[PDB]
Amino acid sequence: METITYVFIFACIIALFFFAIFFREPPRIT
Amino acid sequence: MEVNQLGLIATALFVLVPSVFLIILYVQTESQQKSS
Amino acid sequence: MEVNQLGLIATALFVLVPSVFLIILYVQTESQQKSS
Amino acid sequence: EKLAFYDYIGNNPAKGGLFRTGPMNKGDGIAQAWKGHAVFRNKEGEELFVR
Amino acid sequence: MWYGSATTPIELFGPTRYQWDSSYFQQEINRRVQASLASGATLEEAWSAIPEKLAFYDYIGNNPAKGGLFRTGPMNKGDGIAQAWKGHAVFRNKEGEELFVRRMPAFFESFPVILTDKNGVVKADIPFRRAESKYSFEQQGVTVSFYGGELNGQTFTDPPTVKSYARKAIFGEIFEFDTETLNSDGIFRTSPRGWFTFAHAVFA
Amino acid sequence: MEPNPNRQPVELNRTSLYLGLLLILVLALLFSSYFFN
Amino acid sequence: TLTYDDIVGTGLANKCPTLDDTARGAYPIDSSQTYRIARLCLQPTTFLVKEEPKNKRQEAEFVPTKLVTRETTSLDQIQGELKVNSDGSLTFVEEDGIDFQPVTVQMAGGERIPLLFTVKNLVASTQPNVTSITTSTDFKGEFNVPSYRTANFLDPKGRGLASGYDSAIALPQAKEEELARANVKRFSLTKGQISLNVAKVDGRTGEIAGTFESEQLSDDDMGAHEPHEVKIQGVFYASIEP
Amino acid sequence: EELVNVVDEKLGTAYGEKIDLNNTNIAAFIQYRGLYPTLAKLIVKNAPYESVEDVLNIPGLTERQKQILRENLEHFTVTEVETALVEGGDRYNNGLYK
Amino acid sequence: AIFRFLLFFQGFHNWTLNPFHMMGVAGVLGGALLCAIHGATVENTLFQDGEGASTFRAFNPTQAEETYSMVTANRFWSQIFGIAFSNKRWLHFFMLFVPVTGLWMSAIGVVGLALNLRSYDFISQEIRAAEDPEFETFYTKNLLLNEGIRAWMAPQDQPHENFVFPEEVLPRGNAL
Amino acid sequence: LNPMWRQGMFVLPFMARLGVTGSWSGWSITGETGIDPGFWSFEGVALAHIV
Ligand code: CLA
Ligand code: CLA
Ligand code: CLA
Ligand code: CLA
Ligand SMILES: CCCCCCCCCCCCCCCC(=O)OC[C@H](CO[C@H]1O[C@H](CS(=O)(=O)O)[C@@H](O)[C@H](O)[C@H]1O)OC(=O)CCCCCCCCCCCCCCC
Ligand SMILES: CCCCCCCCCCCCCCCC(=O)O[C@H](COC(=O)CCCCCCCCCCCC)CO[C@@H]1O[C@@H](CO)[C@H](O)[C@H](O)[C@@H]1O
Ligand SMILES: CCCCCCCCCCCCCCCC(=O)O[C@H](COC(=O)CCCCCCCCCCCC)CO[C@@H]1O[C@@H](CO)[C@H](O)[C@H](O)[C@@H]1O
Ligand SMILES: CCCCCCCCCCCCCCCC(=O)O[C@H](COC(=O)CCCCCCCCCCCC)CO[C@@H]1O[C@@H](CO)[C@H](O)[C@H](O)[C@@H]1O
Ligand SMILES: CCCCCCCCCCCCCCCC(=O)O[C@H](COC(=O)CCCCCCCCCCCC)CO[C@@H]1O[C@@H](CO)[C@H](O)[C@H](O)[C@@H]1O
Ligand SMILES: CC1=C(/C=C/C(C)=C/C=C/C(C)=C/C=C/C=C(C)/C=C/C=C(C)/C=C/C2=C(C)CCCC2(C)C)C(C)(C)CCC1
Ligand SMILES: CCCCCCCCCCCCO[C@@H]1O[C@H](CO)[C@@H](O[C@H]2O[C@H](CO)[C@@H](O)[C@H](O)[C@H]2O)[C@H](O)[C@H]1O
Numbered sequence: 001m002e003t004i005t006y007v008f009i010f011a012c013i014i015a016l017f018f019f020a021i022f023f024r025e026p027p028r029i030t
Numbered sequence: 031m032e033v034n035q036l037g038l039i040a041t042a043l044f045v046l047v048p049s050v051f052l053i054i055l056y057v058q059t060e061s062q063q064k065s066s
Numbered sequence: 067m068e069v070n071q072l073g074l075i076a077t078a079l080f081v082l083v084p085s086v087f088l089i090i091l092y093v094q095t096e097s098q099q100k101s102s
Numbered sequence: 103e104k105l106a107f108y109d110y111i112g113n114n115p116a117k118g119g120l121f122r123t124g125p126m127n128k129g130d131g132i133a134q135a136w137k138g139h140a141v142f143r144n145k146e147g148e149e150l151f152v153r
Numbered sequence: 154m155w156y157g158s159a160t161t162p163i164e165l166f167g168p169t170r171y172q173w174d175s176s177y178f179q180q181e182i183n184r185r186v187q188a189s190l191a192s193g194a195t196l197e198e199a200w201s202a203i204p205e206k207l208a209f210y211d212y213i214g215n216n217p218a219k220g221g222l223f224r225t226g227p228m229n230k231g232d233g234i235a236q237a238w239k240g241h242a243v244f245r246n247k248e249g250e251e252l253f254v255r256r257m258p259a260f261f262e263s264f265p266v267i268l269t270d271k272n273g274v275v276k277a278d279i280p281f282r283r284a285e286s287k288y289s290f291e292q293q294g295v296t297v298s299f300y301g302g303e304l305n306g307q308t309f310t311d312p313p314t315v316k317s318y319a320r321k322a323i324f325g326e327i328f329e330f331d332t333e334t335l336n337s338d339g340i341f342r343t344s345p346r347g348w349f350t351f352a353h354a355v356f357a
Numbered sequence: 358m359e360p361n362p363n364r365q366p367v368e369l370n371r372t373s374l375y376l377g378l379l380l381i382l383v384l385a386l387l388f389s390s391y392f393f394n
Numbered sequence: 395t396l397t398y399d400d401i402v403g404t405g406l407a408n409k410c411p412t413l414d415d416t417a418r419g420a421y422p423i424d425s426s427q428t429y430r431i432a433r434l435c436l437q438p439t440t441f442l443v444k445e446e447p448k449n450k451r452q453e454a455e456f457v458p459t460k461l462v463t464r465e466t467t468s469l470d471q472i473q474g475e476l477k478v479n480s481d482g483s484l485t486f487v488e489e490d491g492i493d494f495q496p497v498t499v500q501m502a503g504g505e506r507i508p509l510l511f512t513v514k515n516l517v518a519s520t521q522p523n524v525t526s527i528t529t530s531t532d533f534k535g536e537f538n539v540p541s542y543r544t545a546n547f548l549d550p551k552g553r554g555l556a557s558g559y560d561s562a563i564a565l566p567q568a569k570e571e572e573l574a575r576a577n578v579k580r581f582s583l584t585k586g587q588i589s590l591n592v593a594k595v596d597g598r599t600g601e602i603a604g605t606f607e608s609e610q611l612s613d614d615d616m617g618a619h620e621p622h623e624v625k626i627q628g629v630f631y632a633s634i635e636p
Numbered sequence: 637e638e639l640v641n642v643v644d645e646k647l648g649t650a651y652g653e654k655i656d657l658n659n660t661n662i663a664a665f666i667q668y669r670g671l672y673p674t675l676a677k678l679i680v681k682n683a684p685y686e687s688v689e690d691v692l693n694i695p696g697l698t699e700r701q702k703q704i705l706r707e708n709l710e711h712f713t714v715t716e717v718e719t720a721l722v723e724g725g726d727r728y729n730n731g732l733y734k
Numbered sequence: 735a736i737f738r739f740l741l742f743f744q745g746f747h748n749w750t751l752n753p754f755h756m757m758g759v760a761g762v763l764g765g766a767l768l769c770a771i772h773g774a775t776v777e778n779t780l781f782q783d784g785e786g787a788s789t790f791r792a793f794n795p796t797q798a799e800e801t802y803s804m805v806t807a808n809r810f811w812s813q814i815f816g817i818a819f820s821n822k823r824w825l826h827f828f829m830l831f832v833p834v835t836g837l838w839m840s841a842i843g844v845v846g847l848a849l850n851l852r853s854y855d856f857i858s859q860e861i862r863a864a865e866d867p868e869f870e871t872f873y874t875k876n877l878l879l880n881e882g883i884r885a886w887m888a889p890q891d892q893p894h895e896n897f898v899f900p901e902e903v904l905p906r907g908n909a910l
Numbered sequence: 911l912n913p914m915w916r917q918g919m920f921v922l923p924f925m926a927r928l929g930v931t932g933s934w935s936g937w938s939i940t941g942e943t944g945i946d947p948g949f950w951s952f953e954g955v956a957l958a959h960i961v
Contacts, residue, residue: 001033001038002031002033002037005037005038005041009041009045017816020816020817021816021817024817027808027812027818027820029805031858031862032338032857032858032861032862033858034225034858035071036074038072038075039074039075039078042075042078042079043078046082046083046086047082050082050086050089050090053090054086054089054090054093054094057090057093057094058090058093058094058096058097058102059097060094061094061095061097061098062097062098062100064098064366065366066094066366066367069393069394070123070392070393070394072392073389073392073393073394074393076392077385077388077389077392077393080381080384080385080388080389080392081381081382081385084377084381085377085378085381085382088369088373088374088377088378088381089374091367091368091369091374092369092370092371092373094367095367095369095370098366103450103452103911104911107911113916120391121392121394122394123394124918125916125917125918125919126916126917126918127916127917127918132912132916133911133912133916134449134450134911135448135449135450135911136450136911155849214567217849218849218850219850220849220850220851221851221852221853221854221855222752222846222851222852223853224857232566232567233567258892258895259850260746260850261746261884261888262564262746262854262855262880263563263566263881263884265885265899265903267898267899267900267903269898273896273898275898275900278900278903279560279903280902280903281557281558281559281902281903281904281905281906282556282557282732282904282906283556283557283643283644283647284556284557284661284730284731284732285732285901285902286647286652286902287902288900289644289647289652289902291644291645291647291648291652292647292648292652292653312644312645312648313638316560317570320560320561324566324567330567332568332569337567337568338565338568338857339565339566339567339568339569340564340565340566340567340568340855340857340860341566341567343849343851347849350849351845351846351849351851354845354848354849355842355845355846450911457943457944458943458944460936460944502936502943502944503936503937504935540723540724541719541723544723544724544726545643545720545721545723545724545726546726546730546731546908548907548908549867549868550863550867550868550869550870550874550875551863551864551867551874552878552881552905553867555641555642555643555720556643556720556721556730557731557908559905562860562864563881564855564860564863564864565860565861565864568864573864573865574639575639576864576865576866576867577639578639578640578641579641580639580640580641580642581642581719581720581723583719583723615867615868616867618866618867618868731908732909733909733910
């Protein structure tokens, strides 16, 4: 029940890594 | 294991609550250009 | 009282989660007129 | 033992409840062993049967 | 809140950590007991006069200094709900000499049980490496008697029980706790005086 | 990839917000007792 | 022939002496001459652990287990006098050697059973009227199974027998009553049984070989829990000399 | 129905007062005149003793060794051989140093 | 006289296990990383504005164009770490927030150890290890080190306490 | 006396019906002494899916 709670927050950091990289707002030249 | 019984909530809220605060703002931002 | 230990969470999420879903929509609606 | 076990209402899917969460073992407990068949006789020696 | 103050009564908030540091309560207790004796009173009679409330304050378990940041809940989740004073424990060795248990300095999570005489001469103790114990109980024939409190009048000469009682002595006055009701775990937690002070020192 | 045609905005008015909170909170006052059991 | 730089790493250092299929000989036992065993080796091969009773008294069996350690199991250098007392029977008396090895085997379910595979103070005898040890001969006997851990061993929380803490140091004001079991480290000592059955002989060199089976107890952990039953099936070499 | 720590219990017997011939570890003998080196190894190397004097009967002892032993018998004792203290060669290396 | 203050903390407060000190580290340690990754990114992204190699002079202390190329940088990192800056104004604020914040959490932590309100143990672990003598985690291991640090140190470190610990009391492993 | 269905097992039974009856842990759902699923053990099935 803890194991699960730790593995979740982790699985979240990892999915958040994907999005932050492959789903950012492209830094367009202004 | 003899864990704290309020741990599962103290952690759940500590994540959802402020995390949702941010989701609200972000999305409400996008829509100021009809987005979502 | 010997209550179900997951009750405090089952009730907490059952409220926040969908309740937040609505808050998101509403606010993101308001801002389609710069509001909030 | 296995056979006897099936012959116990406690394994009847019909018993139970909607919010009685968890495995069947949270109910009557974890089956450990068959205490044996019980015959009930009265004073006359006659063999009775439990309904 | 951390130090004293007439605005921080110790019956509303707990005892001060400095009252334990200077054996504040312990002194007043002796000062009374010693007097009662001058008044011609059996050792028992004398101690039995010591109010329970007073003895209670003379217990490290009510020291705001003990405790932990995440050791949540009331002090009763720790050592349990105080039920009664088991009485004052005097520890004598085989020679009859009266030994004294060295108390636990609010600082140490765990502390050894050393027993010394009048002038602090090491007379008895509980060893770690038995290979060469010289002062082990048994080897010194330590015993314990109680006065006042609910164990009043009784004596224990059985090594284990004497030891047990000696380790509980370290914390000052020995009490009887109810640890089933709140499902306590035996680990000290700080008092309101402690928390209040922690919160306000950090918000500050 | 380029802009996607099929694509509308989403909406939810005050009344709906209010009627939702009523539905949620009430379903919660109802079921909470059976969750704590 | 093979030396150290010849065996190192091959793990041949754990397997012990064989007798090319030439055996079946007979080592003449003089009786008027004193015999001793130069080197008695016992090489474990299989470890079984009787499945803890199910509670339901229905004949528990010895199941196989996986060796979680490496090739650190063999007993070697064992020696002592092979006494020839009356009625022809032989009696070996274990004197000294590498007569014990801590082995840990992972069991079917999940458990890990550490035992002290040994034959300490072994004293095995044979059938009466033993003349020239033959494939028909064989020894049997008891031995002492010391205790996995020594009086000095400390546990993760500091407690120990001949040394170490007195109690649950991390729970200052808890009830000792229920922690007794683990705060008082008892040091057991039990009997084990073997039986070396000779399968090969070399009348000439005076060296027999064969299979062995012994049964003993597992580690009780300074008496914290109940010990499991073990059975060990291996092989053994044995160089006899006057 | 009491669990007992054999060693703490044995510190109630003579062991914990005098050198136990059947239990105490060899280095205990380094506290009395010419007794350690050679005799200690003998004492220890010779199984249990049904009683103090029995030391006097160890194989091939010199009328001198015997003379000393008699001198120090007052510092010896005997108690039931205690496995925890004897097992594992603990009598030659009980695991202690300085 | 400070290294002592360090060990004392490890020994009596078990500091290293405090979430606030941990943040403290994460900040001081990561503030160093920023103060070094940024420095290197700038230096190896410089445009050429001189002729020689010692390009320190190529920088006109006087205004004008950026001296390195924020555009090139943002590209490097983004393909070699997925994320990359792209707003010098934010980059430099982060550089203020990171090390500053961590030393603040570092402080709150100690304000706590003043009242010995430490983060010494995890009860769930203790209860288990009290009952089961075969349970061992790097957690428990470190706790014994502390018992050692206090037992042997305390005496000479707290003279006004007149501690006297007979050799038989001193907790010790085997041999050592 | 303590088969999977007493322990509130929901998905385990479905893997049993089609052939997955053992674990990399060496135990069998029928209770057979040290057998050896191929890769296709309950852990394997779970793995495959996660991938
Ligand atoms: C391995 C990584 C690691 C890291 C990165 C850190 C990092 C940190 N530790 Mg931790 N620590 C560690 C391991 C680590 N520690 C371990 C293993 C232990 C033992 C358990 C400790 C024990 C420990 C303690 C006991 C303390 C810290 C503290 C701190 C923080 C330092 C605060 C500070 O700014 O000081 C920098 C110095 C100052 C005090 C700032 C004021 C300085 C003035 C203004 C300078 C005046 C200079 C003057 C002009 C020049 C004259 C000089 C003269 C020679 C000529 C910092 C977050 C401290 C803390 O928590 O603070 C709240 C603290 O007290 N640590
Ligand atoms: C002035 C502040 C204050 C103080 C001193 C106390 C003190 C006390 N409370 Mg009360 N309480 C307060 C406010 C306060 N409370 C408030 C506002 C509420 C409403 C939520 C409550 C609700 C409450 C309940 C429901 C209970 C108590 C109880 C108690 C007593 C037990 C101690 C304890 O619970 O420790 C627990 C403390 C902690 C472990 C909290 C540590 C806080 C962490 C470190 C903060 C999170 C970190 C943060 C996210 C970091 C981000 C950094 C950023 C820079 C990135 C104690 C006397 C208990 C009782 O009745 O006793 C028997 C009890 O059951 N209190
Ligand atoms: C192999 C390299 C290595 C790694 C990866 C870590 C990693 C970590 N250390 Mg450790 N550390 C190391 C070596 C290492 N350390 C060494 C040699 C020492 C001295 C012996 C220490 C001493 C030390 C102390 C004293 C402390 C840490 C702490 C931490 C944690 C936060 C540190 C931080 O924020 O830094 C600054 C931030 C950055 C520069 C960002 C780096 C990115 C994060 C932190 C790495 C995440 C790692 C994670 C395990 C992997 C998930 C990825 C997944 C795909 C597998 C972090 C998990 C702290 C802690 O306990 O935290 C709870 C702490 O207090 N470390
Ligand atoms: C096909 C569906 C299904 C089924 C038949 C099962 C069956 C089972 N589960 Mg699994 N489970 C499922 C899906 C399912 N599960 C899913 C999707 C998950 C992931 C969340 C899980 C997670 C899970 C866990 C974590 C556990 C089980 C366990 C169990 C066993 C115990 C029974 C139980 O938990 O009752 C509990 C059931 C209830 C009281 C739910 C009633 C549902 C309410 C009425 C719905 C709310 C009403 C709604 C809001 C009304 C609004 C109306 C609208 C019009 C306004 C049982 C074999 C347990 C186990 O391992 O057994 C030992 C266990 O610990 N399950
Ligand atoms: C017994 C004694 C024996 C002798 C001593 C021992 C040996 C010492 C060795 C170290 C000397 C290294 C050269 C330094 C310069 C350099 O790299 O150029 C690059 C710039 C030059 O700047 C600049 O110079 C630039 C021009 S140019 O570099 O001449 O082109 C100019 O354009 C720019 O604006 C200006 O800021 O250097 C720096 O600013 C970085 C270094 C200095 C920081 C000081 C910190 C203090 C601690 C010092 C410790 C020193 C260690 C000593 C070791 C023993
Ligand atoms: C991040 C986004 C998440 C959003 C999700 C929001 C979550 C809110 C939902 C609240 C859930 C209420 C349930 C509380 C019960 C509880 O608490 O019990 C659990 C039942 O679980 C489960 O097995 C959950 C799966 C339910 C299977 C039953 C299928 C029902 C279908 C009915 C059709 C729809 C009408 C666990 O069972 C346990 O089982 C045992 C432990 O293995 C013990 O008995 C425990 O005490 C306990 O009873
Ligand atoms: C709808 C919006 C809500 C949004 C809020 C989101 C919530 C997330 C926060 C998570 C909280 C973490 C705490 C978990 C502990 C727990 O779980 O413990 C509790 C401490 O409570 C409390 O007393 C909470 C009040 C804390 C007082 C301490 C002041 C600290 C100030 C420090 C300055 C800031 C750095 C209760 O104490 C209890 O006390 C006893 C019951 O009376 C028992 O021992 C219990 O087992 C338990 O320990
Ligand atoms: C017994 C007394 C107690 C009282 C009981 C309380 C009940 C009160 C009445 C409410 C019921 C009517 C709602 C159903 C009919 C309908 O679909 O109505 C919705 C109402 O919106 C609403 O606010 C209902 C929103 C429902 C929230 C559900 C969240 C689901 C996501 C869960 C996430 C899980 C991870 C939508 O209305 C729509 O509102 C507008 C669109 O947003 C337009 O007007 C549409 O045409 C339409 O009218
Ligand atoms: C389980 C263990 C957990 C470990 C946690 C590890 C945390 C370490 C991540 C570094 C923190 C970011 C600090 C710089 C902030 C920033 O500037 O990056 C931002 C994205 O932030 C984020 O959400 C970053 C999300 C983390 C990405 C993880 C990298 C994974 C490595 C993959 C290896 C590939 C082989 C966006 O950039 C900014 O975006 C704008 C801000 O308004 C401006 O343009 C700024 O200048 C800047 O460009
Ligand atoms: C409350 C409830 C309910 C509901 C629930 C649900 C609906 C759930 C779901 C759930 C889910 C739905 C879950 C999921 C999960 C998932 C996961 C966990 C995943 C994972 C993944 C991963 C981990 C991946 C990875 C990877 C990648 C990405 C790449 C490639 C490679 C790899 C494979 C490594 C019901 C009605 C019954 C009843 C009442 C109550
Ligand atoms: C990119 C993401 C990468 C993620 C990698 C991991 C993927 C798999 C995630 C599995 C999540 C669930 O993992 C599972 O959680 C439950 C708790 O809910 C744990 O179960 C735990 O609590 C239960 C009681 O509730 C105990 O009976 C059990 O002994 C204990 O281990 C399981 O031991 C763990 O295996």
